[PDB]
């Protein structure tokens, strides 16, 4: 067996950024040059590693996160970024080792009328820690008096929709993102080349 990268990159649905999906890759072999020799990605930055050397290396586990964001927003899927995505939805650590792979998904995730399936956290009291996943849907308490599940002044619903049609600008269109993380522990490495 080799690694099911096709069931993460080519999967039918993708997750919202705030509820990003994660897949744990183990006991398989992975050809990575088949990913960088696809020519089908708009973004493919690797950190702490070089994509070509990648098929030469071993890791104990590899993690594939995947989610949809907006065009101008792929800038935030980097170490050391700020903004509502990197602060409040998905944060990479300053010493990330792995690859951020993005591509244009305007063809599939942006329908006429609105694709309101894709959401993002717009309100949060404090920045995420790296690889944190906030799923609460509490009303957001911007004031000092609690909300008690009612929207209103100082009392905001925390997730907001993207609204993606197939007719847009450039960095206001939907992009599917896959973040690969490479972990090497004092344990039997199970993903090799």
């Amino acid at each position, epitope marked *: 067996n080799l690694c099911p990268f096709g069931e993460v990159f080519n999967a039918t649905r993708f997750a919202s950024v705030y509820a990003w999906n994660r897949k744990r890759i183990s006991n398989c072999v992975a050809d990575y040059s088949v990913l960088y020799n696809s020519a089908s990605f708009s973004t493919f930055k690797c950190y702490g590693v070089s994509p070509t050397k990648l098929n030469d290396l071993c890791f104990t586990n590899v993690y594939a996160d995947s989610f949809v964001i907006r065009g*101008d927003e792929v800038r935030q899927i980097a170490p050391g970024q*700020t*903004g*509502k995505i990197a*602060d*409040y939805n998905y944060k990479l650590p300053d010493d990330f080792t792995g690859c951020v792979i993005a591509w244009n998904s305007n063809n599939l995730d942006s329908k006429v009328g*609105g694709n309101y399936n894709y959401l993002y956290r*717009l*309100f*949060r*009291k*404090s*920045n995420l820690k790296p690889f944190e996943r906030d799923i609460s849907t509490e009303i*957001y*308490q*911007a*004031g*000092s008096t609690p909300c008690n599940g009612v929207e209103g*002044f*100082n009392c*905001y619903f925390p997730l*907001q929709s993207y*609204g993606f*049609q197939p*007719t*847009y*600008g450039v960095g*206001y269109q939907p992009y599917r993102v896959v973040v690969l993380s490479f972990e090497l522990l004092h344990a039997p490495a199970t993903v090799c080349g």
Partner: antibody
Amino acid sequence: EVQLVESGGGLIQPGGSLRLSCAASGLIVSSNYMSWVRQAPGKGLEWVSVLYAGGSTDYAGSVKGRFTISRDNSKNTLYLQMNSLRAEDTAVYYCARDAAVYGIDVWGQGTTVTVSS
Amino acid sequence: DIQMTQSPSSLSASVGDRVTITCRASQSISSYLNWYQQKPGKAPKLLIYAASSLQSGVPSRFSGSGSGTDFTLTISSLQPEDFATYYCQQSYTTPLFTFGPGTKVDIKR
């Protein structure tokens, strides 16, 4: 009520510094997108800098590097440090709560900054 | 970047008129669009949020409509206190908001 009280404007020579203060009552600065917005004489509203609830900052291209937004949670007060002022920083300066899709609903009172030699 | 525009720069109206301000975003912004009132020497006042929701404490003669590139603010029966300048603001790219250039409503004569 909910109110954003501003202070600290005045006359200042070009190259000088000025510290604007916005004292919040009825919302928690630490919990909000807090923006500074300014309006030159006879022009419109221009966004300056923002303080995310999480602590991130962003700034207008034209003040990037000279101004720094900040806060003190103890005093529930928003700040703007204005250094290396030029003549075109002259405007009425507003602090405001940006509630995003729900609108910029709370606005300060204005404080006027004249930079002149 | 999204640039905002405003239909007529200034328009004249009589008390009791039905007034329509338009606003246009340089790119589809769905319905992330807010309307503001400003009288000389004072701070802006939020009138409409999310294109058509009425802000608390704002008279119901005010109303918004639109989605995409085009938006409209209506005042059903202009009151004497409504003579002022009206701005639109987009919040698609929050918190980096851009404002419209304004529409002044003065007194017809």
